[PDB]
Symmetry: C2
Subunit: 382 residues, 2 copies
């Protein structure tokens, strides 16, 4: 009957409602459960396709080739084109696929600076996006995401396949798994891989002696699959030193995600600085494989939409027992210390970063500070 | 001489410049190295203080009490008032301190849903903010942050002090440490505490038999310090079950940080729902200590200032080898799967969350997707 109990019960109801909804909306989902499609006229606005050159062309396939889906609207019949459907029209329309202008598989190594497997989702996310891209469909590309980044709370093995030697067909039937999006395949990793990585030197000599501890990824796994995929995304980081060296040793191009926070950024830079040093050692101990580029990009972690939605639900649950002051991001500016250096200690003349980023933080941290003090007073007194 | 090497070298220079700057700006910093101060007329705009009632009043302290700081400006002499200075004027001005209207110490338990010690910095940050608050100075409050949340990459022990029984004076000289901000003290924690927590039952019977495994925090540590602090912030989470139950058992009011992401939010709700269940068990096995409230708030992780600054430095390093498309937050919407459910698989009719949050994600994930494909083509071809 207490305030803490009441809000706890609303929170419980809130959970139920979310649970029931996902139910009601998912049984018609398992009536297919695989993906999404395009209309008819929709294909018009797509690349090398025009209303007619397809509309009147599909009418030909339909009765001298295969099928397509549909559902009415009264006196109107709508189509549902799959990514395979579309990939086919481009086929019958003669437009060459990415596989046609390039023979082998291009390897992209997306480094993971953060020590969270949370990067496996974004990577596969990247792959699903480069396959379902409205203007990339005409390429019918085979993307394989090799996950070589194990984790914990965040979180058929790539590290396993590496140690053994299953030849092509084996890697294909025993290790690679198909994701929800058809063109993309994953070669997963487990918390166990960390131990393989930890003892990569010993575990090597044994399971595969005479091998270059760094070529293992390339040779024992990539080389055998290069004719079966257009893009092979390798997912790894500097924490698993061995898998990192193997990934470089197997990468054509490499992408480095930059953190949008001063302290994590500094680190990033450190890593961008060490790569040449590593890449060198990798040729000096074995294969002079050319790692040429290092393209960069900035990651994000916001989505105002999500913040707003979440906010709203929070208010529905806590009602009036929810401060209208948010708690700022308080840790990517000045490390914590020896003593304890908050954004509050930070002297804006001593700080070598974004003076505004620091101002804003403190201001909000104070605003939060006072709001806390007050809801306290009001509670202590009354 | 390669692109990867060049950018790596800029990154190295960038690091140096940041390193040198912090030097040049820190030796005059160790000429004090402790904190920041207020001007003279500044105290005017503060609470119970007016230009005169202080200006002409300090002139009295100055020659019949103690000191204050200064530094000229030609024909003008400026003052530098410390938080102690100000706390004193309020003293001589007779305005009562928080210690005067409340005898014991009020305990605030800030729960940590995330499994990262990163919460210790924000907590101490909260404390430093409730002490240096322009309109809270007049309270001269003694805040003690008991850190009972150990970690790893993120990261005299509170868990130790708990198991033993150092009486007041001991806790004060042997365990509690002063932070950069004078009024705030911390009772730190180590990765070792996790093991104490893991085996709290056995480690209890031994080091302190007959005790209520849940009252240990309250009795053996808080009770002895309640007259020496106004606010005692307890930092812990649901991962260290034992420390969690001890914190509740020792809390008057409790704050719950809500994550601004649909998946992490759901969890939060789960926890807000379980508290009454836990709080109950805590009285049934021992002390019927009243945990009344559960105030809520939303956390943040953005700081556009920081993103911009960091962005800028990234461009200085990578120049033109840095996509002008950012990578979206791709994981707080629909869990990864069994197969691999990205925001790209997510059917916007099946998704029970913020439909816009999901739209935006996908849109950007595609934009990133294409930009990736292109810088690739341009590199493969030319």
């Amino acid at each position: 009957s207490s305030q803490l109990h009441k809000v706890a019960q609303r929170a419980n109801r809130m959970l139920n409602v979310l649970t029931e909804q996902v139910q009601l909306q998912k049984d018609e989902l398992h009536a297919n459960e695989f993906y999404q499609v395009y209309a008819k006229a929709a294909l018009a606005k797509l690349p090398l396709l025009t209303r007619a050159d397809v509309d009147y062309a599909v009418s030909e396939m339909e009765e001298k080739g295969y099928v397509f889906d549909k559902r009415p609207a009264g006196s109107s019949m709508k189509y549902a084109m799959s990514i395979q459907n579309i990939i086919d029209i481009y086929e019958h329309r003669g437009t060459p696929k990415y596989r046609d202008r390039y023979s082998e598989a291009y390897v992209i190594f997306i480094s993971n600076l953060k020590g969270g497997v949370s990067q496996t989702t974004s990577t596969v996310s990247l792959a699903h996006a480069m396959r379902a891209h409205p203007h990339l469909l005409m390429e019918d590309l085979r993307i394989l995401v090799i996950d070589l980044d194990p984790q914990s709370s965040a979180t058929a093995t790539s590290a396993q396949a590496m140690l053994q030697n299953v030849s092509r067909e084996e890697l294909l039937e025993e290790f690679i798994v198909p994701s929800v999006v058809p063109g993309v395949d994953v070669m997963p990793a487990s918390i166990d891989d960390a131990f393989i990585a930890s003892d990569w030197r010993e575990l090597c000599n044994e399971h595969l002696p005479g091998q270059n501890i760094h070529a293992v990824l390339k040779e024992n796994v990539i080389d055998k699959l290069k004719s079966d995929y257009d893009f092979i995304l390798v997912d790894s980081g500097p924490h698993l030193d061995a898998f990192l060296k193997n990934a470089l040793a197997s990468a054509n191009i490499l992408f480095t995600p930059l953190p949008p926070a001063t302290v994590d950024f500094h680190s990033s830079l450190k890593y961008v600085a060490r790569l040449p040093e590593l890449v060198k050692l990798i040729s000096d101990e074995g294969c002079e494989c050319q790692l040429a580029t290092n393209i960069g990009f900035m990651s994000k972690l916001s989505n105002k939409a999500d913040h707003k939605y979440c906010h709203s639900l929070a208010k529905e649950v806590f009602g009036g027992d929810m401060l209208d002051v948010f708690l700022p991001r308080l840790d990517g500016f000045e490390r914590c210390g020896e003593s304890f250096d908050t954004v509050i200690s930070a002297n804006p003349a001593t700080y070598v970063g974004s003076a505004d980023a620091l101002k804003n933080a403190r201001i909000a941290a104070e605003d939060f500070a006072k709001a806390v003090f007050d809801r306290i007073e009001f509670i202590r007194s009354n």
